[PDB]
Amino acid sequence: PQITLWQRPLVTIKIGGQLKEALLDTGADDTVLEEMSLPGRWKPKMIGGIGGFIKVRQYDQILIEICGHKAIGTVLVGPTPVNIIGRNLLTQIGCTLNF
Amino acid sequence: PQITLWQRPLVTIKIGGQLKEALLDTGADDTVLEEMSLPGRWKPKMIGGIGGFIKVRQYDQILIEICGHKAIGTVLVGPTPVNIIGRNLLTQIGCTLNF
Ligand SMILES: O=S(=O)(c1ccccc1Cl)N(Cc1ccccc1)[C@H]1CNC[C@@H]1N(Cc1ccccc1)S(=O)(=O)c1ccccc1Cl
Ligand SMILES: [Cl-]
Numbered sequence: 001p002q003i004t005l006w007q008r009p010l011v012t013i014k015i016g017g018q019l020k021e022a023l024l025d026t027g028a029d030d031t032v033l034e035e036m037s038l039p040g041r042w043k044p045k046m047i048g049g050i051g052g053f054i055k056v057r058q059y060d061q062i063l064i065e066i067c068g069h070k071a072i073g074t075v076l077v078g079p080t081p082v083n084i085i086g087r088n089l090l091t092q093i094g095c096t097l098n099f
Numbered sequence: 100p101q102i103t104l105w106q107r108p109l110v111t112i113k114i115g116g117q118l119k120e121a122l123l124d125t126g127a128d129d130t131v132l133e134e135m136s137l138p139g140r141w142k143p144k145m146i147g148g149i150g151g152f153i154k155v156r157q158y159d160q161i162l163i164e165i166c167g168h169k170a171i172g173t174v175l176v177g178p179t180p181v182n183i184i185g186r187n188l189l190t191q192i193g194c195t196l197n198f
């Protein structure tokens with residue numbers, strides 16, 4: 001699909017058997033989701049920008065589906081204000097910027 | 100052009116006659132640049148980030164060139180981790196996401 005930027009590029013995703021709404025973010029190196037439970041081991045990490053930094057848990061090799069497109073990659077879980085799908089997963093679905 | 104996301108989508112912009120490196124951020128509603136001098140009056144604005152809200156300066160109707168494409172719009176100035184071209188200007192240059 002071709003997504004306009006007149007509005008925030010919000011799409012539906014399926015992760016951990018759950019359906020959530022997330023922002024396709026090209027400025028994000030990583031994928032960050034609001035508090036939730038995920039399988040496997042994790043390690044602490046800090047991500048920051050406008051407003052400062054927040055602490056999150058890093059889970060690797062997590063299965064996720066963005067708009068029907070299945071992808072695998074690292075997912076960070078923490079007190080983010082909005083679900084974010086970063087470049088690490090955007091590439092897996094073949095997403096690109098065009099103008 | 101078509102821009103993949105394997106690495107940060109950094110491009111060259113021109114503002115106030117100076118060239119700068121900026122990040123194409125679809126996760127950003129607005130365009131935020133590092134501290135710099137801009138003409139005219141400015142108004143206050145609150146922007147939300149990964150770590151919370153902060154106050155930045157808002158300059159309206161500012162000329163700026165992104166990847167050779169000319170645009171004229173709102174530019175916010177504040178302590179951003181990197182220069183960011185948000186949706187407000189990404190739309191002016193006809194940018195969309197595709198996969
Ligand atoms: O928070 S920002 O400064 C911002 C800028 C302009 C307008 C609004 C905001 Cl919130 N920012 C840019 C940034 C930060 C740090 C390094 C490089 C760029 C956002 C915008 N998109 C990527 C960034 N994030 C995702 C995001 C957070 C909150 C709301 C929308 C999107 S993030 O979490 O800070 C993040 C930083 C580092 C690694 C992964 C992630 Cl995912
Ligand atoms: Cl990854």
Ligand SMILES: [Cl-]
Pocket residue numbers: 094103
């Ligand atoms: Cl590719």
Ligand SMILES: [Cl-]
Pocket residue numbers: 171172173187188
């Ligand atoms: Cl604008």
